[PDB]
Amino acid sequence: HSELRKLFYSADAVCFDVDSTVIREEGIDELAKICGVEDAVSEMTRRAMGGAVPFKAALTERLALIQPSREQVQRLIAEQPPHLTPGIRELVSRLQERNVQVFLISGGFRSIVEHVASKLNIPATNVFANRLKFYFNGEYAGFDETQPTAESGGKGKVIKFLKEKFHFKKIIMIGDGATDMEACPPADAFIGFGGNVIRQQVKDNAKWYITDFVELLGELEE
Amino acid sequence: HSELRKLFYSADAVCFDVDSTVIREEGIDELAKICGVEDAVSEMTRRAMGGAVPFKAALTERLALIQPSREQVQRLIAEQPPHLTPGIRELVSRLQERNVQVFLISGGFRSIVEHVASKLNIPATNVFANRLKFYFNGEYAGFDETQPTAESGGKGKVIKFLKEKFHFKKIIMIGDGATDMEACPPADAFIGFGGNVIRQQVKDNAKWYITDFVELLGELEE
């Protein structure tokens, strides 16, 4: 490697997804374990490796199986399961003094990915996670179907939604798997993360890879 | 009272309609007010006159403009704007005691009628109404579109489900409008109330019509 200094310098805006990337654990699964469907959803997710049934589809099932209450989601952010990864926190901290815009694009729910984006001074207007719906009686009522990250290609769309609006110069994407690596083309660049989860799909096969921000906080601290 | 004696006990169950009958106040017009959007609404309810039901979409437009929040309605419920009709907080009990099962029926949000029930000692299982949806933030999302009271003539689609399920063979519906009377052919005996609103299209055309409620309770007292 040699293009990690300038590459990460000529940047104008960078963004990464929450699940297993900016957060150690998985929102959906950490949200199911609170119920009793951990085993189900977890397998329901990993079985959804590639384009095997669009995202929107599997999202409803996996969610219909869960049926989370506002109370539940309100007490998760209370037991604050989302844990930041060893690096990230700072990596973006010093990235804000550089004016370089930072973003969060996860298949998760802002109901949560928003609390995460707080430990990091990232305004909510820079978050992109489908939303959860509830009844005044505090009971699962589905999710917002008009959310770009609700179905496949979602992540790579929100990015473009950003270029045809912010006219950026260098936009980088960092995910913990090809499950969203295919967004580099829309964007201006990508980095596969693997500190919490590897997956060959991104491991050996991915330009500018990485594992654990710390094990790259140096080339950055340089 | 000529032959109304048969009705009112010696019946089975009497489903009351809340808007304009069990409560003087309006279910939605009252909400559009705490939403800072009354008159805005008070002009949509104009050309959309009775007998003509674009409905559902008519309710979605009307709610689309109000956009209530779990908090906003919460503050309304906490302000208890609804005022039950004089002879109800007492007459409702005058049938339950006689082991008669009373039911509240509406198309104006369950978040309200539930308290209406709870403040009338009417079971929570005997309240059918529309359900609004909110986001974690509490913003407006929509409403249950499967709920019976969603589409036109739903007043009956339920008055009929309450039969194939509980069986009553003698159920009465207390209403004030043509939609309350329109559930009669599907239901049993219908009594029109007008202690809040008259609505000629149902007064001089529907059999059995009482002006006040106390002029029905203070009768079987001797």
Side-chain angles (χ1 to χ4, degrees), chain A residues 80-122:
Chain A
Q80 189 224 301
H83 271 125
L84 292 188
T85 275
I88 174 58
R89 179 44 182 291
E90 288 62 44
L91 183 163
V92 54
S93 176
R94 190 191 321 88
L95 190 50
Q96 268 124 178
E97 290 173 358
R98 270 55 183 175
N99 288 51
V100 178
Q101 293 288 186
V102 190
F103 297 124
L104 279 177
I105 311 163
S106 71
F109 325 101
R110 69 164 54 212
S111 320
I112 294 185
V113 312
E114 197 113 78
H115 147 301
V116 160
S118 293
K119 262 80 202 313
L120 300 54
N121 279 287
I122 301 179

CSV table of all heavy atoms in Angstrom, one decimal, chain A residues 80-122:
chain,number,residue,atom,x,y,z
A,80,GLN,N,-28.0,0.6,26.7
A,80,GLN,CA,-27.1,1.1,25.6
A,80,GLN,C,-26.2,0.0,25.0
A,80,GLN,O,-25.0,0.1,25.1
A,80,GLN,CB,-26.3,2.2,26.1
A,80,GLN,CG,-25.4,2.9,25.1
A,80,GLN,CD,-24.0,3.2,25.5
A,80,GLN,OE1,-23.8,3.9,26.5
A,80,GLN,NE2,-23.0,2.7,24.8
A,81,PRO,N,-26.8,-1.1,24.4
A,81,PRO,CA,-26.0,-2.1,23.8
A,81,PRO,C,-25.0,-1.7,22.8
A,81,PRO,O,-23.8,-2.1,22.7
A,81,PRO,CB,-27.0,-3.1,23.3
A,81,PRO,CG,-28.1,-3.0,24.4
A,81,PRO,CD,-28.2,-1.5,24.6
A,82,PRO,N,-25.4,-0.7,21.9
A,82,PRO,CA,-24.4,-0.3,20.9
A,82,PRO,C,-23.1,0.1,21.5
A,82,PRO,O,-23.0,1.1,22.3
A,82,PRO,CB,-25.1,0.8,20.1
A,82,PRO,CG,-26.5,0.5,20.4
A,82,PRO,CD,-26.6,0.1,21.8
A,83,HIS,N,-22.0,-0.6,21.2
A,83,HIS,CA,-20.7,-0.3,21.7
A,83,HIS,C,-19.8,0.3,20.5
A,83,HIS,O,-19.7,-0.3,19.5
A,83,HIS,CB,-20.0,-1.5,22.2
A,83,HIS,CG,-20.3,-1.7,23.7
A,83,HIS,ND1,-20.9,-2.9,24.1
A,83,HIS,CD2,-20.1,-0.9,24.7
A,83,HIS,CE1,-21.0,-2.8,25.5
A,83,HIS,NE2,-20.5,-1.6,25.8
A,84,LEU,N,-19.1,1.4,20.8
A,84,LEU,CA,-18.3,1.9,19.7
A,84,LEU,C,-17.0,1.1,19.6
A,84,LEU,O,-16.6,0.4,20.5
A,84,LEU,CB,-17.8,3.4,20.0
A,84,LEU,CG,-18.9,4.5,20.0
A,84,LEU,CD1,-18.2,5.8,20.1
A,84,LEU,CD2,-19.7,4.4,18.7
A,85,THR,N,-16.5,1.0,18.4
A,85,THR,CA,-15.3,0.3,18.1
A,85,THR,C,-14.1,1.1,18.5
A,85,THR,O,-14.1,2.3,18.4
A,85,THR,CB,-15.2,0.0,16.6
A,85,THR,OG1,-15.9,-1.2,16.2
A,85,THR,CG2,-13.7,-0.2,16.2
A,86,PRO,N,-13.0,0.4,19.1
A,86,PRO,CA,-11.8,1.0,19.6
A,86,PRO,C,-11.2,2.3,18.9
A,86,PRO,O,-10.7,3.2,19.5
A,86,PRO,CB,-10.8,-0.2,19.5
A,86,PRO,CG,-11.7,-1.3,19.9
A,86,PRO,CD,-12.9,-1.0,19.0
A,87,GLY,N,-11.4,2.3,17.6
A,87,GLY,CA,-10.9,3.4,16.8
A,87,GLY,C,-12.0,4.5,16.6
A,87,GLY,O,-12.2,5.3,17.5
A,88,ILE,N,-12.7,4.3,15.5
A,88,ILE,CA,-13.8,5.2,15.1
A,88,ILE,C,-14.0,6.5,15.9
A,88,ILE,O,-13.7,7.6,15.4
A,88,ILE,CB,-15.1,4.4,15.1
A,88,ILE,CG1,-16.3,5.4,14.8
A,88,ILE,CG2,-15.4,3.7,16.4
A,88,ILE,CD1,-16.1,6.2,13.5
A,89,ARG,N,-14.4,6.4,17.2
A,89,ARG,CA,-14.6,7.6,18.0
A,89,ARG,C,-13.8,8.8,17.6
A,89,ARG,O,-14.3,9.8,17.3
A,89,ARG,CB,-14.4,7.2,19.5
A,89,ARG,CG,-14.6,8.4,20.4
A,89,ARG,CD,-15.8,9.2,20.1
A,89,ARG,NE,-16.0,10.3,21.0
A,89,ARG,CZ,-16.3,10.2,22.3
A,89,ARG,NH1,-16.5,9.0,22.9
A,89,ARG,NH2,-16.4,11.3,23.0
A,90,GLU,N,-12.5,8.6,17.7
A,90,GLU,CA,-11.5,9.6,17.5
A,90,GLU,C,-11.3,9.8,15.9
A,90,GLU,O,-11.3,10.9,15.4
A,90,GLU,CB,-10.1,9.3,18.1
A,90,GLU,CG,-10.1,9.5,19.7
A,90,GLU,CD,-11.1,8.6,20.5
A,90,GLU,OE1,-11.2,7.3,20.2
A,90,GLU,OE2,-11.7,9.0,21.4
A,91,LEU,N,-11.0,8.7,15.2
A,91,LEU,CA,-10.8,8.8,13.8
A,91,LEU,C,-11.6,9.8,13.1
A,91,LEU,O,-11.2,10.5,12.2
A,91,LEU,CB,-11.0,7.4,13.2
A,91,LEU,CG,-10.7,7.2,11.7
A,91,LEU,CD1,-10.6,5.8,11.3
A,91,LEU,CD2,-11.8,7.9,10.9
A,92,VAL,N,-12.9,10.0,13.6
A,92,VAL,CA,-13.8,10.9,13.0
A,92,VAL,C,-13.7,12.3,13.7
A,92,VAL,O,-14.0,13.3,13.1
A,92,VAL,CB,-15.3,10.4,13.0
A,92,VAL,CG1,-15.6,10.0,14.5
A,92,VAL,CG2,-16.2,11.5,12.5
A,93,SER,N,-13.4,12.2,15.0
A,93,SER,CA,-13.2,13.4,15.9
A,93,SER,C,-12.3,14.4,15.2
A,93,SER,O,-12.7,15.6,15.1
A,93,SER,CB,-12.7,13.0,17.2
A,93,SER,OG,-12.4,14.2,18.0
A,94,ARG,N,-11.1,14.0,14.9
A,94,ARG,CA,-10.1,14.9,14.2
A,94,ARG,C,-10.5,15.1,12.8
A,94,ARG,O,-9.9,16.0,12.1
A,94,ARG,CB,-8.7,14.2,14.2
A,94,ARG,CG,-7.6,15.1,13.8
A,94,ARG,CD,-6.3,14.3,13.6
A,94,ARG,NE,-6.1,13.3,14.6
A,94,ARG,CZ,-6.5,12.0,14.4
A,94,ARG,NH1,-7.2,11.7,13.3
A,94,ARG,NH2,-6.3,11.1,15.4
A,95,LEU,N,-11.4,14.4,12.3
A,95,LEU,CA,-11.9,14.5,10.9
A,95,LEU,C,-12.9,15.6,10.8
A,95,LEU,O,-13.3,16.0,9.7
A,95,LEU,CB,-12.5,13.1,10.5
A,95,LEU,CG,-12.9,12.9,9.0
A,95,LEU,CD1,-11.7,13.3,8.1
A,95,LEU,CD2,-13.3,11.5,8.8
A,96,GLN,N,-13.4,16.0,11.9
A,96,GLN,CA,-14.4,17.1,11.9
A,96,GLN,C,-13.7,18.5,11.9
A,96,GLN,O,-14.2,19.4,11.4
A,96,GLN,CB,-15.3,17.0,13.1
A,96,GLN,CG,-16.6,16.2,12.8
A,96,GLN,CD,-16.7,15.0,13.8
A,96,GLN,OE1,-17.7,14.3,13.7
A,96,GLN,NE2,-15.8,14.8,14.7
A,97,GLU,N,-12.5,18.5,12.5
A,97,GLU,CA,-11.7,19.7,12.6
A,97,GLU,C,-11.1,20.0,11.2
A,97,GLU,O,-10.5,21.0,10.9
A,97,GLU,CB,-10.6,19.6,13.6
A,97,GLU,CG,-11.1,19.6,15.1
A,97,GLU,CD,-10.0,19.3,16.1
A,97,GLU,OE1,-8.8,19.1,15.6
A,97,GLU,OE2,-10.3,19.3,17.3
A,98,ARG,N,-11.2,19.0,10.3
A,98,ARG,CA,-10.8,19.1,8.9
A,98,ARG,C,-11.9,19.5,8.0
A,98,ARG,O,-11.8,19.6,6.8
A,98,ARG,CB,-10.2,17.7,8.4
A,98,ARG,CG,-8.7,17.4,8.7
A,98,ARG,CD,-8.4,17.6,10.1
A,98,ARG,NE,-6.9,17.4,10.4
A,98,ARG,CZ,-6.3,17.6,11.5
A,98,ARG,NH1,-7.0,18.0,12.6
A,98,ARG,NH2,-5.0,17.4,11.6
A,99,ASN,N,-13.1,19.7,8.6
A,99,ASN,CA,-14.3,20.1,7.9
A,99,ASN,C,-14.9,19.0,7.0
A,99,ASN,O,-16.0,19.2,6.5
A,99,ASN,CB,-14.0,21.4,7.0
A,99,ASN,CG,-13.8,22.6,7.9
A,99,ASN,OD1,-13.0,22.6,8.8
A,99,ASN,ND2,-14.5,23.7,7.5
A,100,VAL,N,-14.1,17.9,6.8
A,100,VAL,CA,-14.6,16.8,6.0
A,100,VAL,C,-15.8,16.2,6.5
A,100,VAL,O,-15.8,15.6,7.6
A,100,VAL,CB,-13.5,15.7,5.9
A,100,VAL,CG1,-14.1,14.5,5.0
A,100,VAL,CG2,-12.3,16.2,5.2
A,101,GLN,N,-16.9,16.3,5.8
A,101,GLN,CA,-18.2,15.7,6.2
A,101,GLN,C,-18.2,14.2,6.4
A,101,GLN,O,-17.7,13.4,5.6
A,101,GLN,CB,-19.3,16.1,5.2
A,101,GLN,CG,-19.7,17.6,5.1
A,101,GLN,CD,-20.4,18.1,6.3
A,101,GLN,OE1,-20.9,19.3,6.3
A,101,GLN,NE2,-20.6,17.3,7.3
A,102,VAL,N,-18.8,13.8,7.5
A,102,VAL,CA,-19.0,12.4,7.9
A,102,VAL,C,-20.4,12.0,7.9
A,102,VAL,O,-21.3,12.8,8.2
A,102,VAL,CB,-18.4,12.2,9.3
A,102,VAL,CG1,-18.2,10.7,9.6
A,102,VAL,CG2,-17.0,12.9,9.4
A,103,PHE,N,-20.7,10.7,7.5
A,103,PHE,CA,-22.0,10.1,7.4
A,103,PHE,C,-22.2,8.7,7.9
A,103,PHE,O,-21.2,8.0,7.9
A,103,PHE,CB,-22.6,10.2,5.9
A,103,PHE,CG,-22.7,11.6,5.4
A,103,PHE,CD1,-22.1,12.0,4.2
A,103,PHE,CD2,-23.5,12.5,6.1
A,103,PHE,CE1,-22.2,13.3,3.7
A,103,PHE,CE2,-23.6,13.8,5.6
A,103,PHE,CZ,-23.0,14.2,4.4
A,104,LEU,N,-23.4,8.3,8.2
A,104,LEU,CA,-23.7,7.0,8.7
A,104,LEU,C,-24.8,6.3,7.9
A,104,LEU,O,-25.9,6.8,7.8
A,104,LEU,CB,-24.2,7.0,10.1
A,104,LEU,CG,-23.0,7.1,11.1
A,104,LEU,CD1,-23.6,7.3,12.5
A,104,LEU,CD2,-22.2,5.9,10.9
A,105,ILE,N,-24.5,5.2,7.2
A,105,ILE,CA,-25.5,4.6,6.4
A,105,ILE,C,-25.7,3.1,6.8
A,105,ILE,O,-25.0,2.3,6.4
A,105,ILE,CB,-25.1,4.6,4.9
A,105,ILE,CG1,-24.7,6.1,4.5
A,105,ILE,CG2,-26.3,4.1,4.0
A,105,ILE,CD1,-23.9,6.2,3.2
A,106,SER,N,-26.7,2.8,7.6
A,106,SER,CA,-26.9,1.4,8.0
A,106,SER,C,-28.3,0.9,7.7
A,106,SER,O,-29.2,1.7,7.6
A,106,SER,CB,-26.6,1.2,9.5
A,106,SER,OG,-27.6,1.8,10.2
A,107,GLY,N,-28.4,-0.4,7.7
A,107,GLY,CA,-29.7,-1.0,7.4
A,107,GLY,C,-30.4,-1.0,8.7
A,107,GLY,O,-31.6,-1.4,8.8
A,108,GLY,N,-29.8,-0.4,9.8
A,108,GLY,CA,-30.4,-0.3,11.1
A,108,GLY,C,-31.5,0.7,11.2
A,108,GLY,O,-32.0,1.1,10.2
A,109,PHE,N,-31.9,1.0,12.4
A,109,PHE,CA,-33.0,1.9,12.7
A,109,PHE,C,-32.5,3.1,13.4
A,109,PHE,O,-31.9,3.0,14.4
A,109,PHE,CB,-34.1,1.2,13.5
A,109,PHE,CG,-34.2,-0.2,13.2
A,109,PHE,CD1,-33.6,-1.2,14.0
A,109,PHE,CD2,-34.8,-0.6,12.0
A,109,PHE,CE1,-33.6,-2.5,13.6
A,109,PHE,CE2,-34.8,-2.0,11.6
A,109,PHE,CZ,-34.2,-2.9,12.4
A,110,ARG,N,-32.8,4.3,12.9
A,110,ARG,CA,-32.3,5.5,13.6
A,110,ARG,C,-32.8,5.5,15.0
A,110,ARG,O,-32.2,6.2,15.9
A,110,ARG,CB,-32.7,6.8,12.8
A,110,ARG,CG,-34.1,7.2,12.8
A,110,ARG,CD,-34.1,8.7,12.3
A,110,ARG,NE,-33.4,8.9,11.1
A,110,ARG,CZ,-32.7,10.0,10.7
A,110,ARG,NH1,-32.6,11.0,11.5
A,110,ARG,NH2,-32.0,10.0,9.5
A,111,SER,N,-33.9,4.8,15.2
A,111,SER,CA,-34.4,4.7,16.5
A,111,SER,C,-33.2,4.5,17.4
A,111,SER,O,-33.2,4.9,18.5
A,111,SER,CB,-35.3,3.4,16.5
A,111,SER,OG,-36.1,3.3,15.3
A,112,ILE,N,-32.2,3.9,16.8
A,112,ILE,CA,-30.9,3.5,17.5
A,112,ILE,C,-29.6,4.2,16.9
A,112,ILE,O,-28.8,4.9,17.6
A,112,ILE,CB,-30.6,2.0,17.5
A,112,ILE,CG1,-31.6,1.2,18.4
A,112,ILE,CG2,-29.2,1.7,18.0
A,112,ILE,CD1,-31.3,-0.2,18.5
A,113,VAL,N,-29.4,4.0,15.6
A,113,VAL,CA,-28.2,4.5,14.9
A,113,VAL,C,-28.1,6.0,15.1
A,113,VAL,O,-27.1,6.6,14.7
A,113,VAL,CB,-28.2,4.2,13.4
A,113,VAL,CG1,-28.5,2.8,13.1
A,113,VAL,CG2,-29.1,5.1,12.7
A,114,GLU,N,-29.0,6.6,15.8
A,114,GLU,CA,-29.0,8.0,16.1
A,114,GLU,C,-28.3,8.2,17.4
A,114,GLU,O,-27.6,9.2,17.5
A,114,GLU,CB,-30.4,8.5,16.1
A,114,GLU,CG,-30.5,10.0,16.0
A,114,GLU,CD,-31.1,10.4,14.7
A,114,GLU,OE1,-32.4,10.4,14.7
A,114,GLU,OE2,-30.4,10.8,13.8
A,115,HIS,N,-28.5,7.3,18.4
A,115,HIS,CA,-27.9,7.4,19.7
A,115,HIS,C,-26.4,7.2,19.5
A,115,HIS,O,-25.6,7.7,20.3
A,115,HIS,CB,-28.5,6.4,20.6
A,115,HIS,CG,-27.5,5.9,21.6
A,115,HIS,ND1,-26.4,5.2,21.2
A,115,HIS,CD2,-27.5,5.9,23.0
A,115,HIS,CE1,-25.7,4.9,22.3
A,115,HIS,NE2,-26.4,5.3,23.4
A,116,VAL,N,-26.1,6.3,18.5
A,116,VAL,CA,-24.7,6.0,18.3
A,116,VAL,C,-24.0,7.2,17.7
A,116,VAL,O,-23.0,7.5,18.2
A,116,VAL,CB,-24.6,4.8,17.3
A,116,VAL,CG1,-23.3,4.8,16.7
A,116,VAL,CG2,-24.9,3.5,18.0
A,117,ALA,N,-24.7,7.8,16.7
A,117,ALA,CA,-24.1,9.0,16.0
A,117,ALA,C,-23.9,10.2,17.0
A,117,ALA,O,-23.5,11.2,16.5
A,117,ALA,CB,-25.0,9.4,14.9
A,118,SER,N,-24.3,10.0,18.2
A,118,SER,CA,-24.2,11.0,19.2
A,118,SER,C,-22.8,11.0,19.9
A,118,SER,O,-22.2,12.0,20.1
A,118,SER,CB,-25.3,10.9,20.3
A,118,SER,OG,-26.6,11.1,19.7
A,119,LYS,N,-22.4,9.8,20.3
A,119,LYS,CA,-21.1,9.7,20.9
A,119,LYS,C,-20.1,10.4,20.0
A,119,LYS,O,-19.1,11.0,20.4
A,119,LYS,CB,-20.7,8.2,21.1
A,119,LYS,CG,-20.9,7.7,22.5
A,119,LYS,CD,-22.3,7.2,22.8
A,119,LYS,CE,-22.7,7.2,24.3
A,119,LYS,NZ,-21.6,6.5,25.1
A,120,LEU,N,-20.5,10.4,18.7
A,120,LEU,CA,-19.7,11.1,17.7
A,120,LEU,C,-20.5,12.4,17.3
A,120,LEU,O,-21.7,12.3,17.0
A,120,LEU,CB,-19.6,10.3,16.4
A,120,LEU,CG,-18.9,8.9,16.6
A,120,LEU,CD1,-19.5,8.1,17.7
A,120,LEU,CD2,-18.9,8.2,15.3
A,121,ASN,N,-19.9,13.5,17.3
A,121,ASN,CA,-20.6,14.7,17.0
A,121,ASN,C,-21.1,14.8,15.6
A,121,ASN,O,-20.6,15.6,14.8
A,121,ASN,CB,-19.8,16.0,17.4
A,121,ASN,CG,-20.0,16.3,18.9
A,121,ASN,OD1,-21.0,16.7,19.4
A,121,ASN,ND2,-18.9,16.0,19.6
A,122,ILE,N,-22.0,14.0,15.3
A,122,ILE,CA,-22.6,13.9,13.9
A,122,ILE,C,-24.1,14.2,14.0
A,122,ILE,O,-24.9,13.5,14.5
A,122,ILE,CB,-22.5,12.6,13.3
A,122,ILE,CG1,-21.0,12.2,13.2
A,122,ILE,CG2,-23.1,12.6,11.9
A,122,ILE,CD1,-20.8,10.8,12.6
